[PDB]
RNA sequence: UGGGGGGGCCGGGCCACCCCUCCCACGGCGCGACCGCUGGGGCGGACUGUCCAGUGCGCCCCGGGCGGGUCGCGCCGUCG
């Protein structure tokens, strides 16, 4: 069979629905703010 | 006092006067359109924080602000 069909059939190219399964890169601003929260967070700790 | 010294002879254009009016260049002022950046709302979602709060992202809405580049227009100035 091989030697009598040699040649290749791709798959069909499908259509895509276009979901993200990752995670995107967490920005500057975000982290910026994270920081700044944890910060706040540990000061009002120590208050009380 | 024949010699010596002068005025000249007829048309055209241009700049000077006084006014109108083009195109172009340069500077200023103002108006308008096309582009960049920035504060609010809505939708969807992703995330963060040892109180329920907060932060980006994609779409739309934006009233807009700022600024310079292109084009159009009006006005001012040039022994242009």
Redesign the pocket.
């Known amino acids: 069979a091989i030697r009598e069909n040699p040649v290749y059939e791709k798959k069909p190219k499908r259509e895509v629905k276009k979901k993200r399964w990752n ?2 890169k ?5 982290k910026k ?2 920081v700044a ?2 910060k ?3 000061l ?3 208050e009380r």
């Open positions: 995670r995107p967490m920005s500057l601003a975000q703010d994270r929260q944890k706040a967070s540990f009002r700790a120590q």
